[PDB]
């Protein structure tokens, strides 16, 4: 139940006022909202080379508070769009916008966008900490870990305007150890951070197969489509090329198929007949006959939608004495097995999958900091609340507790801020 009100005095964000005159192609932005009884009308997007964007005051996620001295808090979608359309070309409109209530936010992340956001303020305070004799990592950790990734991008731009030096380079020189790894990962976008880890897993002639399997098997179509574009712009090489160069056999086929991000979107109606047939094919290709038909497994597990495959794996238990996970361990082995096991976990329960990976990175001597840092950074704005839920439900204690006992220093503080308290 998102926040909503029709009295402007009860809003928490900041207020901005713009005055836009309509051009030939409108005001140059998209309005979203006004569906459910209490939906705020929010700025969906901007149109660059347009009246609203060239003004610069309007940004996405903004909430419309007043249109030409008439409050629209609570007005339906069709009412506020007829206002903008009744305006003639050349006439000016006065928009009051509130910045603080976000859009496109996952309700299951642990780190939320700062309500009283100020990019120039945080850029100044971080500069101070960098040049502080001793580096106030405390300040740097308190700021960046309590900002959203898009807010952190605005910190880097504001820091570059006032210092002419990129924040990633300045923080790479003043920090050290695992704390440097976490901060540099938080500064990158989700696509930039995943693309960098993928290249790192394929550096050298060897391959970190675990990091490659984790990212490829757990990312959706939209995330993979953005990673492929960013990876090609960063390293001048398509991700599929470096995957072929560092993988082979059926393992290569599976990773190439998954990395395409062309999995079928979830259909409106449930295909119960295809659910039964896909289960029969998975059983006839593996446990029933001797050997294994790996291509048939790759086709079904990569092309079908996630909700469909969930019902497929449940129907698979009707044909096979072993479930999908136990079938994988018996039929295939090696890198192909680890990739299939990771894929099925992400389909059945992805938050549970990241919980086990977190527990595996800390249960033994030392800490697999590479796996622990990547998960706490990439899933912080996605499903961290669900991972914490599945974690304490299974392991009794909280994820905050395990990070506490396996990490120390500011590196511990940074990861605890990304967790969001003990469950």
């Amino acid at each position: 139940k998102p926040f909503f009100t029709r009295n402007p005095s009860e809003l928490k964000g900041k207020f901005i006022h713009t005055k836009l005159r309509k051009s030939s192609r409108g005001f140059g932005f998209t309005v979203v909202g006004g569906d459910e009884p209490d939906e705020f009308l929010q700025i969906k997007s901007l149109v660059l080379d347009g009246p609203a964007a060239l003004d610069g005051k309007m940004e996405t996620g903004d909430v419309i508070v007043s249109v030409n001295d008439t409050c629209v808090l609570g007005h339906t979608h069709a009412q506020v769009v007829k206002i903008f359309q009744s305006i003639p070309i050349g006439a000016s409109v006065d928009l009051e916008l509130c910045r603080g209530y976000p859009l496109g936010s996952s309700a299951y992340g642990s780190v939320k966008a700062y309500t009283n956001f100020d990019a120039e303020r945080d850029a100044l305070n971080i500069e101070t900490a960098i040049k502080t004799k001793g580096v106030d990592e405390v300040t740097i950790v308190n700021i960046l870990t309590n900002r959203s990734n898009e807010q952190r991008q605005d910190i880097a731009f504001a820091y570059q305007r006032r210092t002419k030096k990129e924040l990633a380079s300045a923080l790479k020189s003043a920090l050290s150890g695992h704390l440097e790894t976490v901060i540099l990962g938080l500064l990158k976008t989700p696509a930039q951070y995943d693309a960098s880890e993928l290249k790192a897993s394929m550096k050298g002639l060897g391959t970190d197969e675990d990091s490659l399997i984790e990212i490829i098997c757990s990312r959706t179509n939209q995330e993979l489509q953005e990673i492929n574009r960013v990876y090609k712009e960063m390293y001048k090489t398509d991700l599929e090329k470096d995957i072929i160069s560092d993988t082979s056999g059926d393992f290569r086929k599976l990773m190439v198929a998954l990395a395409k991000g062309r999995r079928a979107e979830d259909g409106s109606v449930i295909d119960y007949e295809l659910i039964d047939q896909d289960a029969r094919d998975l059983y006839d290709a593996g446990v029933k006959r001797k050997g294994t038909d790996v291509p048939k497994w790759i086709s079904i597990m990569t092309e079908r939608s996630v909700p469909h495959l969930q019902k497929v794996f449940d129907r698979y238990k009707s044909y096979s004495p072993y479930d999908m996970l136990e079938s994988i361990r018996k039929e295939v082995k090696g890198d192909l097995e680890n990739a299939f096991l990771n894929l099925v976990q992400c389909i059945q329960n992805k938050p549970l999958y990241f919980a086990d990976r977190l527990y595996d990175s800390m249960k033994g001597k030392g800490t697999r900091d590479k796996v622990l840092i990547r998960i706490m950074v990439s899933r912080s704005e996605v499903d961290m609340l669900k991972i914490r839920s599945e974690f304490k439900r299974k392991y009794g204690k909280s994820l905050y507790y395990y990070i506490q006992q396996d990490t120390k220093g500011d590196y511990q503080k940074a990861l605890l801020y990304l967790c969001g308290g003990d469950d």
Binding site: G26, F29, T30, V31, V32, D35, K44, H77, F84, Q85
Partner: peptide, 7 residues
């Protein structure tokens, strides 16, 4: 899918 209007 979600009610959107080009303004």
């Amino acid at each position: 899918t979600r009610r959107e209007t080009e303004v």
